Design an enzyme around this catalytic site. Structure first.
Site, PDB file in Angstrom:
ATOM      1  N   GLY A 181      -6.969  30.735   9.296  1.00 41.38           N
ATOM      2  CA  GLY A 181      -5.737  29.999   9.497  1.00 41.38           C
ATOM      3  C   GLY A 181      -4.612  30.446   8.589  1.00 41.38           C
ATOM      4  N   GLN A 182      -4.613  31.723   8.221  1.00 45.44           N
ATOM      5  CA  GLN A 182      -3.541  32.260   7.400  1.00 45.44           C
ATOM      6  C   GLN A 182      -2.231  32.270   8.182  1.00 45.44           C
ATOM      7  N   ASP A 183      -1.125  32.115   7.449  1.00 46.27           N
ATOM      8  CA  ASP A 183       0.187  32.140   8.086  1.00 46.27           C
ATOM      9  C   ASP A 183       0.465  33.484   8.745  1.00 46.27           C
ATOM     10  N   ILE A 200      -1.861  35.328   9.804  1.00 45.29           N
ATOM     11  CA  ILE A 200      -2.915  35.454  10.799  1.00 45.29           C
ATOM     12  C   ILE A 200      -2.816  34.390  11.883  1.00 45.29           C
ATOM     13  N   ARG A 201      -1.871  33.459  11.754  1.00 39.51           N
ATOM     14  CA  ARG A 201      -1.661  32.479  12.813  1.00 39.51           C
ATOM     15  C   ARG A 201      -1.262  33.116  14.136  1.00 39.51           C
TER      16      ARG A 201
END
Ligand SMILES: Nc1nc2c(ncn2[C@@H]2O[C@H](COP(=O)(O)OP(=O)(O)OP(=O)(O)O)[C@@H](O)[C@H]2O)c(=O)[nH]1
Ligand SMILES: [Mg+2]
Lengths: 570, 18, 415, 180, 198, 142, 10
Positions: D69-71, D73-74
């Site tokens: 849920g990385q920004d 990686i969103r």
């Protein structure tokens, strides 16, 4: 290899001589320097077989400039073969004699040429007609000394219209290199005789029987009308070059016809179909046809005025045809088909050819400039294309809008609002300068003109000379118009363009602006923010003097490049 | 037979126009 | 006024060269390949090059570029016509135009090149006439070349007298993406294959609008041929005087006349196609083909090319009639139909995948092109009226002709 | 054609199926995937990339593709949307300030025209703190009933213990296969 | 699933550029069809064919996710193919190399000395300005080990990271201290290169 | 550090390519074409060194296919030639009598050898037999 | 051909 080939060619069996000749011909074709055995093949030249003599003649012609000295052992063979009863052998000998580029051989070749000039065989006469011209090209004075011009002139007055066409082509070639002294022109009787054989000449003979009239000039309407009455049928010939030659001849003869008579209208109406049919030729002939239409369109634009749909480029058309289609459409652009032109240009802006896209943008700009009745439509199309977010399209549209605003800026104030926020991050020098000029000249409908110029003032010292000058002009115009919100901007521009600016023209302009500002800021309104006169558009029509001579040069290299026949030959 | 339409015989001239 | 007619290859090797004037050095061909490479890589490539004061005007063949050097202000149109005539002669003598014949038929190629043009002026280009004095398997040249009739050798005798005609139609359509047709031209082409005895003087008569108006019959169905281009055998004076088509047909198949007129009628095939292209997810092809042609005619081999995505993969075809094949070489949906009755309507619903990652450069929108070929259907309504076969000896000819309707520039602009 | 080999394979089971594992960072997704595959709570650093594994249970190969849920990686979840049949939503009820962001991410990911056959699979992770809500408060806050043409099912799974994982797997199997 | 040798032989049979394009597209369509089915058995051959086509001057942007999938696989040939694809068709401006950081980190602690070597080589050849920010911690761990086949790779990775990240050289000073006594020539050369770069 | 390495044939076809700089594909394609044109337009006595855009492009072809490199203007030039010779010897030893046919078909092995030998534009192993042993151990793993 | 030839001929 070479020794074995020489031994085979110096044998007494023809079954080895033919193979050796074939091998010698193939080695030269394969890119082999076989000039070393030129004296060795000379012995096996006078042979009864005709399949071997042609190869020897070809080798001698291709091995004539390299070994002119060894070529002296062939005049006797040509003389002996120039009397064979078989017309094919005599024609081959005549063709090979003129092909030999030897200065010491052409002198002795005059007697066989004179003997073959009045030959009963039509093939021999046709070959000698070209041989006379080939000899005159090498030695011009030798032909005059031998007295071949008189013999060439009577060839037009003889039967065998193919031989007549060959003689006419040879006479035209000789006269083209001639200084115009002792011209081979003839009275209307000769023209009528040539026309009487024009319906009997072959596909290639028609071009020869048509180029001769390209130099003659009629003196009355009756002669011109009679000549057009026979040149008209040439518009229905399957040869695309015969149609082009007939069109060129009709255009040349139309310089003496009278528009008051009904012949001009018939000639104009009977030629549009020919040009339209020429547009459906091979892709290679498409560029030539487009060049001919462009060169004829500037002379008589009333012919193809209604022919606009056939000028639409096809999906499989070549690049050289696609580029010419836009120019043809622009040259034929009018208020009657303005919507069709706009629709065709809009679809041309969705392609992938960057050069094609630039050409389409330029054609759209030219169409907008030429016709003021469709300026709003052109502006709307440019705005829609800019809204598509295309880097090349945006760059082309910036220049197009800059050019349109300079010509018709009276009612272009409703477009500056959309252009105010137009992704000004574009780095193209031809578009940034246009945007700066539009902002400076139209800094009345943009309420944030001072704020937009700040982003362009960060690197004005290293942007460009034209860009720097445009920015300096825009800042000065903004200060003169609105000096409240741009008081410090003018000082900053003067300091950055006159202190840290090393451009000589830029430095001079900055100094002049500073002097004008410090002398009388009130007078700067009438000095700098003055009403410029009407801008004279760059006329794409050629000069009437070059066009008149360009009409006579139709279908040649002087017509495709639209350049004089003396400015391109060497 | 033949693809593209069967060949048909043609006349000699405009018999209706003399 | 060409200087040297040469034959190049796909690697830059000059397969065959034949200088006609010698005014240009034979080493100038080596700069043609680099010049062509420079022109093609900058968008300025043209069939007519320029090496200093020497121009290289040439066309591209199947495997070779027929380059012909020149130096003076020669007629480029004449050079192109000579190149076309040479290509036609090569096609008539050799069934294929590739490198396999250039290196194998040098014995006859040199003779053909020498005989065709002398000093830059072609003199003989009739393949049927040229086949009588230059053979690869020599007597005096035939009198046909010296005689006025250079397209029909005298003394030809056949057991029967059969002349097969071919009225081939060419339906070219330019439909814009808005749904309107811009360029809708029909190019007629009467190609006959004459097999007669002697030197017959054919007198072709059709239902021309001009002929009907002149006779006074300008009220029935008459073809309004805007452009009529007859062959070399057709006498121009006779056609210009009173629209009299009199010419001696040659021996074999040849193009007699090529009609070309515009058409203001509705298209034979109506193609209603839609594109439900999801962004990087999928796409739909709601293509509907409406046959506006007559129900009595059947268009054999209907092939409506539908340009699908170049990176499309995992395709599925939900059609109604006809095989649907995706060809990755051409990057299009080949809507192939064998028989399509007039008035028929085939509906297709395409669905293909798309990679998640976007492409690096734009791909363009090729136009949808149909390949309909409807035999025994004349859209222009032109009907052949008579063919006056006249022979001095006197014989009863049996003329024959068929009408074939196909698609020409039958493209449809996409959205 | 004959498909007797397919019937013979189906006599012992043929369907394998697939599954997805997306959600915000620090949502207990890696620990849950490890417990499902191995059965232990493994310590893992934040997922800079992703984790792809398979689970053999009930004769179905449950292939799980863990997504962080990385920004940065969103927006990278669209890469797994191709040739995907399942989808599992892992919520983080322990982060009130991140609940709105997780709901917005789920809604944006649920607004794609390519993922239509993937049923909803809500997994209630971090079921060990007293602040965690029930199986209806989270659904009501996210409005899972407002997902037209979406078969959603909320299941509370304890990361530390592992209760409720089997029921969720059975529900997923029943939603995928429509036979006995 | 055609082999790479067969594809090369078929491409060698192409004469014209337009026909060569059609032949390449013939295999590209099949490769796309196999990749859209999530093929796992013959993926190495498709990856090799795609790499050859991309090197031939053909577009292969669609073959990006398949390399990321093969990178996180378990087989050795598939891992090598994925590493080669990441090194060739992957770059800093691709925008798709962000997800490869997790695969590199997972392969950075692998027991195999060749998979870790491939992962380190890929990071050195295609390191970005952000991957080094999250990979500098594991790079120093492998640099303090006693693996001769790994010391040279660790030195190269540290040099590549320092070139990409000049502000991260402070974390390499306490790792290269007392490292000039290596008997092997490769380790000494790597240490000298790292010292010269620093 | 070597910016890039390009194994190109005499006909202009490239058989190997390995660039250590993150450049755009269109830019990389233009750079490769320009390098091929410059190298293909040079004689046999040009010193095998070209300064193309502040980069010492060194070319040393041992067969019909040539080799090229791009070193920064901060190191020696003969070192590039020595590295190229060492790589050619390693490639010949790993395969056995390396020829043109084995390069197009076995480009995967050449890429692996290059990766195990030169990483990041810098060298990875100075010796010639340790690299061969490592490549053999990596290939025998399956 | 010119391709089957060895690189260094060792
Ligand atoms: N105390 C406690 N903490 C938990 C529990 N489940 C998850 N966590 C926390 O949630 C975090 C998430 O760990 P992982 O599952 O390995 O990683 P993730 O959920 O995929 O998050 P990202 O890797 O950033 O995408 C862990 O660091 C734990 O601290 C649990 O049952 N009890
Ligand atoms: Mg995780």
């Amino acid at each position: 290899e070479i020794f074995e080939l020489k031994a085979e060619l110096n044998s007494d069996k023809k079954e080895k001589k033919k193979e050796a000749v074939k091998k010698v011909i193939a080695s030269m074709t394969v890119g082999k320097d076989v000039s070393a055995l030129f004296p060795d093949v000379v012995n096996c030249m006078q042979t009864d077989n005709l399949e071997l003599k042609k190869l020897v003649y070809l080798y001698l012609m291709n091995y004539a400039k390299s070994q002119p000295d060894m070529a002296i052992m062939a005049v006797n063979t040509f003389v002996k073969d120039c009397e064979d009863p078989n017309p094919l052998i005599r024609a081959l000998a005549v063709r090979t004699m003129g092909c030999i580029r030897v200065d010491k051989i052409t002198e002795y070749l005059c007697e066989p040429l004179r003997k073959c000039l009045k030959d009963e065989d039509p093939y021999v006469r046709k070959t000698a007609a070209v041989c006379v011209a080939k000899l005159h090209d090498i030695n011009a004075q030798l032909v005059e000394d031998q007295g071949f011009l008189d013999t060439l002139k009577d060839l037009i007055s003889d039967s065998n219209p193919m031989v007549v066409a060959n003689a006419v082509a040879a006479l035209s070639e000789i006269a083209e290199s001639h200084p115009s002294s002792n011209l081979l022109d003839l009275n209307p009787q000769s023209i009528n005789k040539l026309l009487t054989a024009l319906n009997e000449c072959t596909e290639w003979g028609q071009i020869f029987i048509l180029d001769c009239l390209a130099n003659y000039m009629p003196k009355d309407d009756r002669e011109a009308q009679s000549i057009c009455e026979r040149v008209t049928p040439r518009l229905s010939h399957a040869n695309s070059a015969v149609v082009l030659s007939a069109v060129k001849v009709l255009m040349k003869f139309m310089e003496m016809l009278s528009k008051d008579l009904d012949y001009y209208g018939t000639l104009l109406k009977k030629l549009a179909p020919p040009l339209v049919t020429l547009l459906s030729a091979e892709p290679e002939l498409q560029y030539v046809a487009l060049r001919n239409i462009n060169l004829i369109v500037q002379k008589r634009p009333e012919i193809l005025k209604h022919e606009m749909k056939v000028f639409f480029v096809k999906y499989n058309d070549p690049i050289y045809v696609k580029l010419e289609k836009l120019d043809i459409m622009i040259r034929l652009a009018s208020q009657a088909n303005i919507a069709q032109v706009l629709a065709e240009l809009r679809e041309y802006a969705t392609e992938v050819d960057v050069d094609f896209v630039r050409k389409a943008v330029r054609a759209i700009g030219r169409c907008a400039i030429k016709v003021e009745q469709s300026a709003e439509r052109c502006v709307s199309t440019l705005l829609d294309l800019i809204q598509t977010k295309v880097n090349y399209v945006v760059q082309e549209a910036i220049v197009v809008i800059k050019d349109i605003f300079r010509k018709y800026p009276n009612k272009y104030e409703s477009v500056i609002a959309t252009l105010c926020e137009n992704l000004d991050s574009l780095d193209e020098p031809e578009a940034r300068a246009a945007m700066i000029w539009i902002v400076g000249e139209y800094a009345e409908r943009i309420d944030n003109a001072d704020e937009l110029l700040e982003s362009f003032l960060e690197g004005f010292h290293d942007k460009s000379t034209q860009v720097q000058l445009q920015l300096l002009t825009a800042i000065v115009k903004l200060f003169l118009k609105k000096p409240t919100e741009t008081q410090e901007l003018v000082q900053q521009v003067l300091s950055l363009a006159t202190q840290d600016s090393d451009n000589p023209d830029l430095r001079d302009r900055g100094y002049i602006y500073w002097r004008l500002l410090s002398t009388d800021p009130v007078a700067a309104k009438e000095v700098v923010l003055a009403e410029k006169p009407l801008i004279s558009e760059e006329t794409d029509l050629i000069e009437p003097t070059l066009l008149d001579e360009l009409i006579c040069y139709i279908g040649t290299l002087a017509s495709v490049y639209h350049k004089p026949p003396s400015a391109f030959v060497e | 037979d033949r693809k593209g339409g069967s060949y048909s015989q043609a006349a000699g001239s405009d018999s209706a126009q003399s | 006024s060409a200087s040297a007619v040469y034959v190049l290859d796909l690697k830059g090797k000059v397969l065959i060269c034949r200088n006609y004037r010698g005014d240009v050095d034979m080493s100038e061909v080596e700069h043609f390949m680099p010049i062509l490479m420079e022109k093609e890589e900058e968008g300025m490539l043209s069939p007519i090059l320029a090496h200093g004061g020497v121009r290289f005007m040439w066309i591209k063949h199947n495997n070779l570029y027929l380059v012909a050097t020149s130096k003076k202000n020669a007629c480029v149109s004449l050079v192109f016509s000579f190149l076309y005539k040479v290509v036609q002669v090569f096609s008539e003598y050799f069934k294929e135009l590739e490198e396999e014949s250039i290196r194998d038929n040098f014995v006859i190629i040199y003779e053909l090149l020498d005989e065709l043009m002398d000093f830059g002026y072609p003199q003989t280009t009739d393949s049927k006439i040229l086949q009588e004095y230059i053979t690869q398997e020599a007597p005096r040249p035939p009198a046909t070349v010296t005689n006025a009739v250079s397209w029909r050798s005298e003394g030809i005798k056949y057991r029967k007298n059969e002349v097969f005609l071919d009225v081939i139609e060419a339906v070219n359509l330019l439909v814009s993406a808005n749904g309107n047709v811009l360029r809708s031209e029909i190019v007629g082409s009467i190609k006959m294959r004459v097999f007669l005895s002697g030197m017959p003087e054919l007198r072709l008569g059709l239902n021309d609008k001009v002929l009907f108006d002149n006779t006074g019959r300008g009220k029935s169905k008459s073809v309004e041929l805007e452009d009529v281009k007859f062959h070399q055998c057709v006498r121009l004076s006779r056609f210009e005087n009173d629209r009299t088509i009199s010419f001696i047909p040659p021996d074999g198949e040849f193009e007699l006349m090529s009609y070309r007129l515009n058409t203001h009628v509705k298209p034979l095939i109506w193609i209603e196609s839609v594109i439900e292209k999801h962004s990087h997810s999928r796409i739909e092809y709601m293509v509907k083909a409406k046959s506006q042609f007559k129900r009595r005619s059947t268009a054999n081999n209907v092939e409506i090319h539908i340009p699908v995505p170049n990176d499309a993969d995992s395709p599925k075809f939900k059609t109604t009639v006809g095989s649907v094949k995706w060809v990755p070489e051409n990057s299009e949906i080949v809507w192939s139909v064998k028989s399509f009755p007039g008035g028929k309507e085939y509906l297709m619903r395409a669905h293909f995948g798309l990679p998640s990652v976007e492409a690096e450069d734009k791909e363009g929108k090729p136009p949808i092109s149909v390949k309909f070929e409807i035999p025994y259907f004349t859209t222009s309504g032109i009907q052949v009226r008579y063919l006056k076969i006249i022979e001095k000896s006197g014989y009863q000819a049996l003329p024959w002709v068929r009408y074939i309707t196909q698609n020409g520039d039958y493209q449809l602009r996409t959205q | 054609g004959n498909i007797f080999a397919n019937l013979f394979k189906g006599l012992f089971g043929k369907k394998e199926m697939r599954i997805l594992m997306v959600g915000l960072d620090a949502a207990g997704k890696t620990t849950i995937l490890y417990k499902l595959k191995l059965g232990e709570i493994v310590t893992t650093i934040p997922t800079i990339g992703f984790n792809v594994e398979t689970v053999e249970y009930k004769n179905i190969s449950f292939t799980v593709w863990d997504v962080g849920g990385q920004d940065k990686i969103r927006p990278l979840w669209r890469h797994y949307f191709q040739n995907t049949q399942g989808l599992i939503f892992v919520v983080d009820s322990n982060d009130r300030e991140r609940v709105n962001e997780a709901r917005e991410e789920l809604m944006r990911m649920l607004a794609e025209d390519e993922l239509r056959d993937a049923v909803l699979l809500v997994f209630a992770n971090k079921q060990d703190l007293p602040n965690a809500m029930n199986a209806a408060e989270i659904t009501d806050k996210l409005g899972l009933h407002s997902l037209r043409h979406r078969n959603w099912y909320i299941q509370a799974t304890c990361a530390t213990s592992g209760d409720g994982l089997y029921e969720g797997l059975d529900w997923l199997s029943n939603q995928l296969r429509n036979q006995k | 699933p055609i082999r790479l040798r067969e594809l090369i032989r078929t491409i060698r049979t192409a004469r014209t550029q337009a026909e060569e394009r059609e032949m390449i597209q013939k295999e590209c369509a099949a490769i796309r069809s196999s990749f859209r089915e999530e093929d796992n058995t013959y993926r190495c051959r498709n990856v090799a064919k795609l790499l050859y086509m991309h090197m031939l001057g053909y577009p292969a942007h669609f073959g990006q996710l398949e390399c990321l999938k093969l990178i996180a696989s378990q087989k050795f040939t598939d891992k090598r193919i994925g590493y080669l694809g990441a090194m060739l068709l992957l770059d800093e401006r691709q925008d798709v190399h962000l997800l490869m950081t997790n695969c590199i980190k997972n392969d950075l602690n692998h027991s195999t000395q060749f998979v870790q070597g491939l992962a380190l080589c890929t990071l050195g050849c295609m390191g970005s300005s952000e991957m080094c920010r999250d990979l500098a911690g594991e790079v120093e761990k492998l640099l303090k080990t006693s693996n001769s086949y790994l010391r040279k790779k660790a030195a190269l990775c540290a040099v590549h990271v320092i070139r990409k990240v000049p502000e991260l050289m402070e974390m390499f000073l306490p790792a290269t201290k007392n490292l000039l006594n290596e008997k092997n020539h490769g380790v000494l050369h790597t240490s000298v290169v790292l010292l010269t770069e620093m | 550090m070597i910016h890039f390495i390009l194994l190109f044939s005499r006909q202009g076809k490239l058989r190997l390519q390995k660039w250590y700089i993150t450049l755009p594909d269109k830019e990389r394609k233009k750079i490769t074409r320009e390098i091929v044109q410059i190298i293909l337009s040079r004689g046999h006595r040009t010193s095998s060194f070209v300064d193309w855009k502040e980069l010492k492009l060194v070319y040393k072809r041992y067969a019909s296919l040539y080799f090229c490199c791009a070193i920064e203007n901060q190191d020696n030039e003969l070192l590039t030639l020595e590295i190229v010779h060492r790589y050619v010897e390693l490639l010949d030893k790993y395969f056995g009598n390396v020829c043109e046919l084995d390069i197009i078909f076995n480009f995967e092995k050449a890429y692996f050898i290059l990766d195990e030998f030169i990483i990041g534009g810098e060298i990875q192993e100075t010796s010639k037999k340790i690299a061969v042993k490592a490549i053999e151990d990596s290939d025998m793993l399956q | 051909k010119g391709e089957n030839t060895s690189l260094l001929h060792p």
